[model samples]
Target: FHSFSFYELKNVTNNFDERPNKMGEGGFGVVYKGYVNNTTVAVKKLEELKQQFDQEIKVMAKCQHENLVELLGFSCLVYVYMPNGSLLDRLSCLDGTPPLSWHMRCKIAQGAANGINFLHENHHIHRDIKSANILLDEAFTAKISDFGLARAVMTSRIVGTTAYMAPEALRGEITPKSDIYSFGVVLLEIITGLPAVDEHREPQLLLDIKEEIEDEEKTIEDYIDKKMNDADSTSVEAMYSVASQCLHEKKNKRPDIKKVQQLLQEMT
Candidate 1:
């Protein structure tokens, strides 16, 4: 709702310092951490997305929720800041930093599901729903961000990160259900602490574990992140069932976001 001039943003970001203030880059453009009107914010420099800017801003402005990142301001180029960065940034294992607990991971999943559910209920289809687009606040609460590829229900397009894309989406067929598929991939990332696509240019993580998830005798515990020392086996099983349902070959067979959220809420 706020209109920020380019000059205002430049001053706040110290002319977009790459060393200390730059957050990260995506398909849209680079994001910089800056202070605007004495308040800390993230400023993104828009590029090659002139057509999407207005629509993204409109959708972001109207779709505010606790589980969705707030759009503080925008113009032709930059937008709001998510202070704690993205879920993707926090997912990797570190030597000294504390590992993400299974409970917190479940909380993040539930919050993200709530955001996706709200979007679907409001007739919006977020074409991109990967961990990279899911931002976290200082408290580490997941907030769905980036509406660059979002569109109304029934719109058709082949767009989204490769490994996260639903089969139908890769074939240029997109629906609200497509996002459910992406959410399922994010759930997998949260559980396994692995990239959606492994180094062999194959989605082996999903392929490798599909049977393990299906076989009742196989301990799903073997597939979980071994780093998650305190993970609850029951919660892992519950989440796996919902995620596998979301990854069904038939988009129609995928559980709705509301159903996914209900299942996730039951985990904790």
Candidate 2:
């Protein structure tokens, strides 16, 4: 990986101008958009307390894939700027953006599944896997960010978003299964265009409908996102089936991340 200096980053982001350079902020840090080497980049200015400068950076240095966000270098972490923003923002239509088409959404799901499989293959787990961490490039391809971040959090103790966190994750004993569980929630979000947790629905939590899915109290058709009127039910049904397995109550019963990747890839 190319080593970057603070001054270089400062120059690109215009001294981290809070107004225009700012992209987003989270528990980890704030992100700023910058121009470097004739390309746009997203620079994460990690909070001092939440950074593992030595450990996690090396892990990220090796795990690059087409579907994974390229860690170009770092002042903090310099990644290729994603023009389409995050899946979470897209789902919320934050800037009057049009709803994603079914075709594009399916493509994104497969891309994320592929990127995550690579992460697991490298024996690194992304403690956070919400839609927020899934970024999209100019072509709307998924490029997952924030892998191997546990070192930054003390003991990895519930350092993820609560709505998408699995049962074991909530207890701070996360594993690959916990990620599958969290991915399951993401699946629901893609299919339903709903937030992970909301006070509006009957269950309020998207993942909470697992029981209804199995009991036939709700059919797959019933859960389709209203915005996705062009959705293909057959494909949607397939995703829901895989999501159900990911969300199994027992961690041992959940499918492996590889299995998740395969199932998503198989969707036509």
Candidate 3:
């Protein structure tokens, strides 16, 4: 990491615009876009740091790929600016964005699967795997967030929806399969274009609806995002089946990320 000067970062960040206009939010900090040097970049402004950052600087600095948010520098972790923002924002169609083609969704899904497989293969568990944490590059390639830091900061907190949490995660069991379970939630969100949880839409948790679908109370098409008209039913159902497999209740019952990546690739 460059350990780049704060002055350059501050200026590029509009003096770190205490923004009233952040690009992305995370447990760690707000993500801001920057015009560093000749290229655009994203900068994470930490609320507090020192010890927690040291290990992150070491481990994450060593892991970089097309599917992982690459480090541009480390002014609190400067990254290649993601023009498309996040999978969550795009899924929610924030600001009236155009509907993504099915091919694009598969690309995002596969790349994210690859990223999680990469981390788990390297003996790391992302701990948090959801559409919100899956960012998209200008090319709309999936670049996973908090690549390896969440494993260190196991601090207690639950501000966001638990629809992404594995049953084991809800019970405080952190394992690689827990990430696979979370990724299942991402698949549901991706397919249905729904937030991880919405009581108004359904009395059951979003994942619980999978059970009802099995019970034949409502067909999968009934729950699918009508916005996802581009995808063929066959492909959508295939991914949904994988999501059900990943959303399995037991820890070992869920497929490992490696196998999930293979299944997603097989879809292509």
lDDT (Cα, tens digit) per residue for candidate 1, span 48-164: 377677777878877988899777777534545665667776777533446688978988999899999899988998888899999888777999987877887333556788888
Candidate 1 lDDT trough over 10 residues, lowest sum: 201-210
Q: Which candidate wins on lDDT?
A: 2
Candidate 2's residue-wise lDDT over 125-220, tens digit each? 787888998998999999888764542112544577888888777877757677788888888898888889887767988887888867878877
Q: Which of 1 and 3 is ahead in lDDT?
A: 1
Cα lDDT of candidate 3 equals 0.79
TM-scores, all models, native as reference = 0.91, 0.91, 0.91
Expressed as tens digits, the lDDT of each residue in 33-96 for candidate 3 is 7886688988887723555466556657667767888777785778878889889889888988
Q: What is candidate 1's CA lDDT for residue 182?
A: 89
lDDT of all predictions:
0.80, 0.82, 0.79
Please rank every candidate by lDDT, starting with the best.
2, 1, 3
In candidate 2, which residue ranges exceed 4 Å CA deviation?
47-51, 148-156, 199-201
User: Which residue pairs does candidate 3 place in steric collision?
Assistant: none
